[PDB]
Amino acid sequence: MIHNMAYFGVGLITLMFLIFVMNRRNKSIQELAPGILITTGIFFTFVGIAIGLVHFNADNVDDSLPTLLNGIKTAFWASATGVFFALIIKILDIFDLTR
Amino acid sequence: MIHNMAYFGVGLITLMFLIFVMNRRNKSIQELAPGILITTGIFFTFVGIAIGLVHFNADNVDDSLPTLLNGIKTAFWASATGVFFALIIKILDIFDLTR
Amino acid sequence: MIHNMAYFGVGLITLMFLIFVMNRRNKSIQELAPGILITTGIFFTFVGIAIGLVHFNADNVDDSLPTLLNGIKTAFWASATGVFFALIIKILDIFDLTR
Amino acid sequence: MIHNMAYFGVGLITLMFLIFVMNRRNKSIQELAPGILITTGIFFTFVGIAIGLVHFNADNVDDSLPTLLNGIKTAFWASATGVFFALIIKILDIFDLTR
Amino acid sequence: MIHNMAYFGVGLITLMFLIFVMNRRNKSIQELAPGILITTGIFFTFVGIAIGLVHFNADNVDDSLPTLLNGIKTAFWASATGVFFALIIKILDIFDLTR
Amino acid sequence: EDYWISLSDMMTSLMMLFLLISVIYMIKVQDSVKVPQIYKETTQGLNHALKKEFDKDLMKWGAVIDKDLTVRFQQPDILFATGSSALTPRFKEILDDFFIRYLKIMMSKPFINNIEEIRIEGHTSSMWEGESDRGKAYFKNMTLSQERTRATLEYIMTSDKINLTGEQKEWLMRHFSAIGFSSGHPLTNKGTYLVDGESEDSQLSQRVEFRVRTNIERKVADIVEKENLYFQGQF
Amino acid sequence: HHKEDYWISLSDMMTSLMMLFLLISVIYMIKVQDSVKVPQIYKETTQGLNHALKKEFDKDLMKWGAVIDKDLTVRFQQPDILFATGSSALTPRFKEILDDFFIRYLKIMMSKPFINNIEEIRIEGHTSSMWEGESDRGKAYFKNMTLSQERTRATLEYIMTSDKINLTGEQKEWLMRHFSAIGFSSGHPLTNKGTYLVDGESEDSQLSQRVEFRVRTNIERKVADIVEKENLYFQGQF
């Protein structure tokens, strides 16, 4: 539902990262993992703004604020979640090179 | 006009996605599918906002702002739809790699 | 110039697209054209912000709207033009694969 | 805390850059250094504002606004820091190609 | 300070572009030239906005935001410069593909 | 050329940086934006309520409401005595019927907290009998007007037909002002306040008004200390 | 294909939307700017008068006994020496106050940044609850009002008809337009702390008895212009 949209975005990117790390050995899923994780954060940024402005009125800003702030939250939380988990995949890439 | 463009854009992206997934076997059409789906949604978001920008009256800011946001809010649904369907294509590509 | 930049941005991308289609049989110039048509659109978006804020006055924000609306028009018309013509080349790439 | 979170993010990027330049010879860690340095700066920019948006609600405006602006004023210093050191790594790769 | 570093950011990008075209034949510096040129422009744009953000506060938004926009007007000239010179390198690559 | 993946995240951060900035500016100006809306709702709400209650009584009383939240009473020589502050029985019966329904609107949930002052204003024509001095035609007119204005206020709270409860009287003490005006603020033939190139009247400029002042200055003021407190809170 | 160039279009979309929200913020300023200007216009004129009153009368409050109470008012304490014993007649002591204070007081009011920012100068005469004679609550309230109104009006009578206080033609006509002689009563008492009663404190019966020169700012007209300009514009599209 609408209010539980920021957690759905974080939960889905977290779930895909868990799927991305259970393989950890294909090396073709891992090369596509940072792009897919970042794309989903962009996806939740697009749909987050879409639901933020779906009930946005320039006159009644106060009544349009709870949905707009929620859309900003799911945009920032998923972008942070997507970049953080894409960075973990990148960090794990070095650890394979060192040893 | 702006709302019809957004609905046509969202409907178009779904139509290409159905065309993209009914083949699913070319292995080269599917490789270009994420790019085309996202680019098409980005194109319709660009056009929807641009059409809303030419109707904006700098003299009458008070009434042009609600009209500008009305076409802006529906333009984000085209970009989100393109990224969503392209994510499914890349998710399906990951599922193939797990086999 | 300033208020003709949106048409110059659109016209430049159409000219490059016409150059790309007359070099269609190369197939090496292609697959680089979509990344360059959009990049020129990105260039005119940055120009739009640069020319939309060059005459911005903190004391007088009312009179800066027409100049800033010029930049948003340049940014959105050129970016849509670059994305649209990159789509056409991408679509024509599908036709080569399917034929 | 968000000031320290941004300072930690900026301080961490300088720490990885030092590790990335003390090796300077692997040529496989080095090629992945600019992407990770930028990605780390992108993450700290996102999480710096995302943390400040956790308690920022429609009712907690007079309370969570001071901590939201602290994140805003310091989030982009980590993103610039990561790109600055990533640019040095890329520039140092140019100087190797000239010899 | 933001205005002064705009010339330095623009002036530096022209200097690196000149170094990129002095070689013009390595084929390994030239492939990384557009990425570094654009990244440098984005870096100076981010610093220009980061510098202008430390003076932004919510105590008086009716004049801090107009001050913020008046300070970051020259931040996007380096971004436009970086993409413009990267386009020239990319365009020159196409010109060498016609032979 | 995988640098575009990182660049798209930087522009995404730059995108929502200005989205929050636009939102933060929108939030912090809501108090200032609401002030014209509060004024519009209260003034038109009071005017509509004043029109609804009294439009059937303007012609019989001689009163006029002119969207200024005031009940202007024309036609002198029946409200007070000729050259005296004594209240005539004609205006006494007018106050009995008018004020009870008038105070009901004033002591209402949407209006009791949006009213700062209710002004009883006694205006007198610029000419005073037996005098030919402009300076002396303004003060003895003010002496009469102040007593006439106070006479109405005295009669309202010291009557036997107005159902003024023991608690409503304190509200009049803290809001009702008996402001006795003088030859100043005249009215032209159209009932509009005089301009630099217009004349005045005598039977229309002599009037008694019941003007309502909304507490929008306090609401505007309360933003000032809140902004000052917010500014002082960061130090 | 091998390289995904949709990230270039994603960067293009993000950059264009970055300035679209920048445009929206700029447009929102223009949409609501007169409303935003009202609090700062009130802020600058109230402190401007407050600073000007302090800049002009700090050295004279001790002699007069007046105090500026951050409400654009000059509250003169210690009555019964400014007015006659139970009468509106002005004592000599308050006259030299009126000759000195008002001439340099009207200059601030009749100044370029303040002449068009004022609706009303309220001369207010307040009286303690305890009347000199009867102890009634209602009839003594209006007995104070009769006295206070005359005491306030007598102040207004001498404030421009005095030979020493030489008011010009352009200055007197500003007084008949912007000055009000309001005679208050027990309804506005002052507690021992020196502020208006809020929790039901005990009236000092000496701080309440006062004469004030309050300034009203035309901030209600500025809000009315915003309402009027919207109503006229709304009616224009019909």
Author numbering:
A (entry chain D), B (entry chain C), C (entry chain F), D (entry chain E), E (entry chain G): 1 to 99
F (entry chain B): 13 to 247
G (entry chain A): 10 to 247
Show sentences the authors wrote.
Using cryo-EM structural analyses, we show that the Zorya type I and II core components, ZorA and ZorB, assemble in a 5:2 complex that is similar to inner-membrane ion-driven, rotary motors that power flagellar rotation, type 9 secretion, gliding and the Ton nutrient uptake systems. The ZorAB complex has an elongated cytoplasmic tail assembled by bundling the C-termini of the five ZorA subunits. Mutagenesis demonstrates that peptidoglycan binding by the periplasmic domains of ZorB, the structured cytoplasmic tail of ZorA, and ion flow through the motor is important for function in both type I and II systems. We conclude that Zorya systems, on their own, mediate protection by recruiting nuclease complexes that can damage host DNA in vivo, leading to population-wide immunity.
ANA-3 and ZorA II-ZorB II from Sulfuricurvum kujiense DSM 16994 yielded protein samples that allowed structure determination by cryoEM at global resolutions of 2.2 and 2.8 Å, respectively. The structures reveal that both complexes consist of five copies of ZorA packed around two copies of the ZorB N-terminal helices, as seen in other 5:2 ion-driven motor complexes. The type I and II complexes largely differ in the degree of elaboration of ZorA and the length of the ZorB N-terminal helix, with the type I complex substantially larger than the type II. Unexpectedly, the C-terminal, presumed peptidoglycan-binding domains of the ZorB components, are ordered at the top of the N-terminal helices with the domains dimerized. Similar domains are present at the C-terminus of MotB, but structures of the MotAB complex have not resolved these domains, and they are considered to be mobile with respect to the intramembrane complex in the inactive motor state. Although the arrangement of the ZorB peptidoglycan (PG) binding domain dimer with respect to the rest of the complex differs between the two Zorya systems (Fig. 1h(iii)) by a ~35° rotation, the dimer structure is well conserved (Fig. 1h(iii)). As for all other such complex structures solved to date, both complexes are presumed to be in an inactive state since they show no open path for ion flow from the periplasmic to the cytoplasmic face. For the ZorAB type II complex further processing yielded a low-resolution volume that accounts for the predicted first helical domain of the rod (residues 110–140; 11% of total rod residues) and allows docking of AlphaFold models for this region to the high-resolution complexes. The volumes support modeling of this region as a 5-helix bundle and suggest that it emerges at an angle to the vertical axis of the complex.
